[PDB]
Design a binder for this molecule. Structure first.
Ligand code: HEM
Ligand code: HEM
Ligand code: HEM
Ligand SMILES: [O]
Lengths: 679, 323, 681
């Protein structure tokens, strides 16, 4: 149980009498009044203690990544990695460390939809026996900007316009694309966010990245440069944009509910922790500067080396107390890890400590149960708002004869203390500059686009076409085109058509044809289909529901979550047509006999919106899902112009449809149904 | 200009050099570093004052009605209403008073969709020459509960489940319908929320209500019981649910944008402020108790009297500072 | 151990390496620098997490009573008092309840002197098994004002002038006496604050009062009006003003050190809890309205009935986490107690809950270890800043099918819930007035003055004389005279002399009635344990050996003895440079030490000129028992004190010890203070 240490703060109210927050049993369903129909009395202490706590329930949302959700789990080290790091949680084979992970979007506020297009947070806390260690990462290996002093500019430009606070959770407006084109460093992360990484199927189907180069340091101070990677054991999977848009309205909680259900049903998601390791003398060996967070290291130059596996298997008990209150910091570092002179990382260390003072309005937020380390806290800090401990040592200072030297200093040689890498040097003038080594903003965007499949590439261009079409200012649109033309002339040409703008002339300076592995989503089928969702469209008339139940029980044997849909909640029905939408499922199959709700009288009913069964099948087909029909239900496929000939379309008897749908879920998205420019 | 008094706090940055918050011109696109590829210095005061302000930008959202938008306008009285109220802003024909109005949903958080099904808030401030007078109303004339001590119970039950914070901005989950069925007073507002009032076409196409019976008092202390009504001059209009759902994803800002567009286009929306007036000795004469906020007074028993008109004709300049 | 429940939050750093607040061993004595003499690096996470916690150490002081100190203890009931109250902590003989008590002044900020002249706070929390019950009282039984809405006006007027923030911790300025004269209800508390109650010898030598009439209610709902009293088992004792003033400079921590020392030495102070009980139908039957907080109920009309005893026997471990952070509320009420329509108490209920939001900057302050009840919290409250728990019940609302009805409602008959007194009614028009029964502002101030001894009365007149002479505005001073004249023409006449104003009788409220239990100096102390004796000695000759034997015998009687000399020779507790008469309750010159009172021994680089003579002079002039052993008689002579004066003891060691211990019971010798008319020719 990853949540074991949280047991002692849990409050059980079963069988208990209602109390105030200072004890004493009460009733609190009636205000105290002066006469039968009289005014409420100030002396009603019960009312005011209850309402005061309600009145003050909210705390400020995170300044970025406000929308998110998380879970507890366990990290297991695969080996004794003392040859590369002194870090205790990586110090022995099969060593286990509790974790908590919070996934998120970036731009939207607390209540915005999970399926907005956005970068995604992927933040992990290791509660190691030598302190909390956070990898505060994203699902994309590069960031928009090269210096942390520019983060407010990026965020302001992406978040809603400050006059009317429009639009919510979206980069599709003038200020964002004005920034993207005025600060060309942003073009790499933008391309990733315009790819499938911007609309992932779930948190469980994301890879994760620390982005920055850090340092791993051994006991003797020798260091290696390192990139952190999380490799999902579920495989990477993405939606298509037209599907994410509807899903945002039909279920804004799609991702947080997906993670909750996977854990609750015993299908805990897993990620392997992997590293790229680079010697210090190769920091600038690979065509870019590893201090530059707008570049990633191609795995051709440094393969991913697996160090262990993380499994998330415990949901929180109270979302606010745990998920909302947890306070991540890249400065949560432990012995055996160090920073690098990455100018974006450098400013993060300041920003995350400082921002907790706003979100928690006090300096004692690390005493909150979800923030507490398991290893013990011994220092001379005292007081502060909400001080929750009582310190014995009255000589709260160092050095001191009266406390006998305790708490005592720890460094590299004694007490397993943290230490900065011994060899790191400073040299040169104090400057407000960036190294000329950072100046290439176009090569790696071109490399990323090169390494996607043709329809994957078309998804990127259609995202850009959609987004830039919302930009009202003509010059900004031409600025965007001028910058895309430096990445690829064909990309600029294809986007220019949607904007009604001329195809610009080639600017070949940064063009190249190289490819790299591990960045594509749609070029690989899923390693498992467990937890994927099948909507079975049925009907309460005839014998369709009995067949739908048999279909359901077989699909569940493969670990799928199957929803039987009909006009009303008859026996065996999981959802009504009125509440159903194709966005909820990874495959749609029509049960035999249910073709009666796709035309005529069965399609016109007061119990669901007109055309709803046909709309679900149409949606599922057009969004690239496996779609199927059993027996006579093939007529439902005919009614929407779909043929069994097609990839990802299955008809025939039950066992044939089951095998086909299950194969199709491995493919997940059938890109044959998406037109490519000049195909 | 309804916003006339706010111009002295307006700050124009066109044509100026970047400064810190304590003055002095600066550049702030590069951190100070110790060497060409070096670490950032703690003595970069420019960096820290810039990032500290960004780090501290957010304030807690409203505990309810967190999702909303507003605008400025003018209220004009149609008459000298001194025979029923001493209220200064109603004391003369054609008297004008600045207003600000915020419209909202109730359950959803700051970034939830405008076209969620919900009660809608309709909060009006009159900046009168005798103090601020707020009518903090909804687009539905009745409320769920009969005693304010039960508000945390109602709100907890409708807002997302506290274990996983699901579902956003929605009554369609177990705890809400548990409460509606366990606290039967809730059924009136429920029915209103399940009608077109729950999914309006826009803020301009809603009516508004103070809900509670209040009192109008004259100079010499004579009182009448009063119900406040806002009657939209744009007409009431609503969507259908299957459309509001898609709209929640296609444009979460639909109502926000619609209000902004109408004002900027010169199509300012208006409402008439109207009252039902009841003698004190009739507080219990109409088949219910006028102190009970789960009931409305049918207009057959007391028709509306029109006091004046409000027009919303100026959008805010900074959403945060104003709305 | 009354602190037992707090042991789970205590942190032991002995034998440990230094860490950050998120774990990980560290060193934090050098900033991380870019080169040997380089600038400090922003990536020094150790520096910033260290200094951030330092930079955010302070919280707002209390808006009033900012200055004070407290301790843990035990309350023991003397009986089963369910015949008068359903309160659990009073439900069985020898039933014990943990307490915390904080004493305080009122006007001064956090770092002002203990021995300022002021009303004093006396706040007790009972951690009962049916919730926290607080009695938030003062060492004076009456308050300045009759309606809580006037509290900011009173407090603004006695706190420093808002232009220069002058004066600190004092009523002796224009605005305060402008308010006392403009709002005559304040005159009663003013007289108490001008008496010994304003300058008590220690927290342990104060009585305590709930002030308000409350209600005790039995299980069946029958009620009685009640006044709470704390009666100190150490006796009431007070300083004189000219001594309190010097003490404010020589030791601003005099009272909090007193309490800490008494508890550490095993002399835990005690108070008895006593009540006055009044029938509901007699609320207005004793010459005033018992809803009026400017009145007290004379003990001749209703005697004190002891319910139990409280003993304070454990100091805090961390002052900030316990004493500074504790949040008292008169709304901290339990089953068996109820409020009254006293308009001052009424507004207090709102104000103490509200002010916690400012001091603790969040609504979860009852989760702080010092504020937590011992009885258990079960409700549907959630979230809030700094939420320290993780609630299991996901159906956080009532009523509810899904949560099976839990947590469940408790009332009078089910679950031992709180209930308002059943017979209480409201009748009449909603009003912004006060009952005309509150109108008399002068009778009880006169009753209080009438009940003090002649020198005690002179202390009151001399305090007013001192204070009003600071008022620059002439009309304010005359306004003060006119109001004083309504209490007593003689009092007004004697104050007028100091102010140079003219002395006519206004007899509407004059009377000669007296009542018991309001004087301090008319009764000697029941014990001299913990009282302090300064033994003045010297390092030359045999004086020190004699002073040690003197100290030994005095300590056998429970006295705290300080032997003083030129330097810290063996057996010396304090140097003359560091000593002052304010620190002691009696001053004894050891034999041989007369050499430091004149000639060569009195002029030394090791202490200020004349310091031993000044300590003895201060001690005598301030009414203390003073003594000299053997030849040290000459020291008394050098300051003009005669051996046979009251409270002056000369002779051999044995008679001096006996005389000093007897004089400590008297405590202050009031024949040394002139009374108006004494100097007449
Ligand atoms: C490689 C670049 C970055 C990555 C991978 C990243 C990732 C993240 C993630 C995952 C979170 C959400 C943590 C959670 O779930 O609670 C977050 C929040 C935050 N980020 Fe970043 N971020 C980056 C850049 C920056 C920069 C440059 C700044 C400012 C200099 C910044 C300031 C913040 C702040 C203030 C928060 C809110 C933290 C809180 O309120 O607890 N981020 N970031
Ligand atoms: C007739 C019944 C009610 C109506 C018409 C109503 C209306 C509103 C409206 C329109 C707002 C948002 C105003 C804005 O745009 O900022 C609001 C917010 C709020 N309401 Fe109500 N409400 C009702 C019942 C209650 C009750 C019973 C309580 C608690 C006792 C309550 C507590 C609050 C609070 C605390 C806020 C947050 C206000 C702020 O943060 O500024 N409401 N209400
Ligand atoms: C009989 C009248 C009163 C008595 C006996 C009394 C007593 C006390 C005491 C002893 C304290 C300090 C408790 C501690 O040591 O922490 C205190 C604080 C305080 N008092 Fe009163 N007081 C009275 C009148 C009032 C009134 C009328 C108000 C306002 C309506 C008021 C407002 C406050 C506030 C706001 C605090 C600060 C509490 C905190 O910060 O925790 N008091 N009072
Ligand atoms: O971030």
């Amino acid at each position: 149980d990853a949540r074991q240490r949280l047991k002692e703060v849990e409050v059980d109210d079963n069988g208990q009498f209602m109390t105030t927050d200072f004890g004493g049993n009460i009733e609190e369903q009636f205000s105290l009044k002066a006469g039968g129909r009289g005014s409420t009395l100030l002396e009603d202490f019960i009312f005011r203690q209850k309402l005061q706590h309600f009145d003050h329930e909210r705390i400020p949302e995170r300044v970025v990544h406000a929308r998110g959700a998380g879970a507890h789990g366990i990290f297991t080290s695969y080996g004794d990695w003392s040859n590369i790091t002194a870090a205790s949680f990586l110090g022995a084979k099969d060593k286990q460390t509790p974790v908590f992970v919070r996934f998120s979007t970036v731009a939207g506020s607390r209540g915005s939809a999970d399926t907005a297009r956005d970068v995604h947070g992927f933040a992990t806390r290791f509660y190691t026996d030598e302190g909390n260690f956070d990898i505060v990462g994203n699902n994309i290996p590069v960031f928009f900007i090269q210096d942390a002093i520019r983060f407010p500019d990026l965020i302001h430009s992406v978040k809603p316009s400050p006059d009317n606070e429009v639009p919510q959770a979206a980069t599709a407006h003038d200020s964002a694309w004005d920034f993207f084109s005025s600060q060309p460093s942003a073009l790499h992360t933008l391309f990733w966010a315009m790819s499938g990484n911007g609309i992932p199927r779930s948190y469980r189907h994301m890879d994760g990245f620390g982005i920055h180069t850090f340092r791993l340091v051994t006991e003797d101070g020798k260091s290696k440069l390192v990139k952190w990677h999380w490799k999902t054991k579920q495989g990477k999977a993405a939606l298509v944009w037209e599907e994410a848009q509807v899903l945002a309205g039909k279920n804004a909680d799609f991702h947080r509910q997906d993670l909750w259900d996977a854990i609750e049903s015993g299908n805990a998601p897993s990620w392997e922790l992997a590293v790229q390791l680079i010697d210090e003398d190769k920091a600038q060996a690979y065509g870019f500067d590893l201090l530059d967070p707008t570049k990633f290291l191609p795995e051709e130059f440094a393969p991913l080396q697996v160090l262990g596996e993380m499994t998330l298997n415990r949901n929180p008990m109270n979302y606010f107390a745990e998920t909302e209150q947890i306070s991540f910091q890249p400065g949560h570092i432990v012995r055996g890890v160090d920073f690098t002179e990455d100018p974006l990382l450098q400013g993060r260390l300041y920003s995350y400590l400082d921002t907790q003072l706003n979100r928690h309005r006090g300096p004692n937020f690390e005493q909150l149960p979800i923030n507490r380390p398991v290893s013990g806290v011994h220092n001379n800090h005292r007081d502060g708002q909400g001080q929750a401990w009582i310190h014995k040592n009255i000589h709260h200072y160092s050095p001191s004869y009266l406390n006998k030297g305790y708490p005592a200093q720890a460094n590299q040689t004694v007490g397993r203390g943290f230490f900065t890498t011994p060899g790191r040097t400073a040299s040169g003038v104090l400057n407000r500059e960036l190294s000329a080594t950072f100046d290439d903003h176009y090569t790696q965007p071109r490399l990323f686009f090169n390494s996607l499949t043709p329809v994957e590439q078309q998804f990127v261009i259609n995202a850009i076409r959609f987004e830039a079409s919302h930009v009202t200012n003509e010059q900004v649109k031409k600025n965007v085109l001028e910058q895309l033309n430096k990445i690829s002339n064909d990309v600029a040409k294809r986007v220019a058509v949607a904007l009604g703008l001329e195809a610009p002339q080639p600017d070949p300076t940064y063009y190249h044809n190289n490819v790299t592995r591990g960045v594509s989503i749609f070029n690989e089928s899923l390693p498992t289909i467990a937890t994927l969702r099948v909507g079975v469209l049925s009907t309460t008339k005839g014998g369709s529901l009995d067949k739908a139940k048999a279909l359901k029980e077989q699909l569940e044997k493969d670990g799928l979550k199957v929803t039987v849909i009909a006009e009303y909640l008859a026996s065996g029905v999981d959802q009504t047509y009125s509440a159903a939408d194709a966005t909820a499922f990874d495959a749609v199959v029509v049960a035999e006999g249910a073709e009666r709700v796709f035309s005529g009288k069965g399609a016109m009913s007061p119990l669901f919106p007109a055309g709803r069964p046909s709309q679900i099948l149409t949606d599922g087909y057009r969004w690239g899902k496996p779609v199927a029909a059993v027996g006579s239900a093939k007529k439902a496929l005919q009614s929407i112009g779909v043929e069994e000939k097609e990839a990802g379309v299955y008809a025939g008897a039950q066992d044939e449809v089951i095998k086909g749908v299950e194969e199709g879920l491995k493919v997940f998205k059938f890109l044959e149904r998406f037109a490519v420019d000049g195909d």
